């Protein structure tokens, strides 16, 4: 099956010009503990936000330009970025917003941090119906001596 | 010779205790660069936000209250932490607002961050009158893919 997981600020923003304005290391654990040991597809920005292959995970680049990284498999399609998981449980698409698009609609399951931050964004998570999904798990956390704004961990199933 | 350094956000307000709201993986490296092979001084707050000894340093915590950890020096007064750094061409004070109130009398040098973002807040970096200091050193740098704000270091010598 294949899930999507993203982070969003208030109005469904994931990305700016530049970096995203938090300090959110408890997030970025739920992030890693959630793709551990499992493919990730990605856009070329995210790639390159990233700045490096993502430690115990299948890093699959979805893009249209040439591989600049060894390290990585690079793919030109949907269809061949599935091809490239195998047979495993779960694929999971971590953005950009125009990644998200194209997946949405074959996504069984949303990993979704909600973040207190107001901020003016480039891209956004596609408008999803809460009337397709069922949320079975939230966590709320306020900001703390590490992390920078308040957040709430949500996994939701396609009803 | 003491040294503060800290990072100030718009209207020199600094951190109190949560997490300030910006990503400069490019300000720490020059945290890092600048506070590597000396003692470094703090108080309660900023232990609890770095969350484990800095390496490569000689970390000293300025508290009242008992010290949990047999990793660092825990302190009770201004004179102890002196005393507890030994014979050393600088010290580095790294904050929070109590810590450099009580040691800026004494310091010599300032190596600030002036990031351009505008957080509410409480604390403030204390006032110091650049009359009384000359900035010998400033380096812009733009938002980038990895650092979420414009941050300009500035380094001052106490005339
Ligand atoms: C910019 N970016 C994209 C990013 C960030 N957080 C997200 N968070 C969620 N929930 N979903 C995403 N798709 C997501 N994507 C990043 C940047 C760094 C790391 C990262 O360093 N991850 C390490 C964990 C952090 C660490 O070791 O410092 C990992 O092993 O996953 C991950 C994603
Ligand atoms: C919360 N905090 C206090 C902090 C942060 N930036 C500052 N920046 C400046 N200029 N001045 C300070 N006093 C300052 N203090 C922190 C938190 C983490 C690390 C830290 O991880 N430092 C690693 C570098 C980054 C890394 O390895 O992840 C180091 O070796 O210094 C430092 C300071
Ligand atoms: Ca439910
Ligand atoms: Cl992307
Ligand atoms: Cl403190």
């Not at 970096?19 to 070329?44: E, H, S």
């Not at 790639?47 to 040439?66: A, V």
């Not at 009337?131 to 992390?147: G, T």
């Amino acid at each position: 099956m294949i899930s999507l997981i993203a982070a969003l600020a208030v109005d469904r923003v994931i990305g700016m010009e530049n970096a995203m304005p938090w300090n959110l290391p408890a997030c970025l654990a739920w992030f890693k503990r959630n793709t551990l040991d499992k493919p990730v597809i990605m856009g070329r920005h995210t790639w390159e936000s990233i700045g490096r292959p993502l430690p115990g995970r299948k890093n699959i680049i979805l893009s249209s330009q040439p591989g600049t990284d060894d390290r990585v498999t690079w793919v030109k399609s949907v269809d061949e970025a599935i091809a490239a998981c195998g047979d495993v449980p779960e694929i999971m698409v971590i953005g950009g917003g125009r990644v998200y698009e194209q997946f949405l609609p074959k996504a069984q399951k949303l990993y979704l941090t909600h973040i207190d931050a107001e901020v003016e964004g480039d891209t956004h998570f596609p408008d999803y119906e809460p009337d397709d999904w069922e949320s079975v798990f939230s966590e709320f956390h306020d900001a703390d001596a590490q992390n920078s704004h308040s957040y709430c961990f949500e996994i939701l199933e396609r009803r």
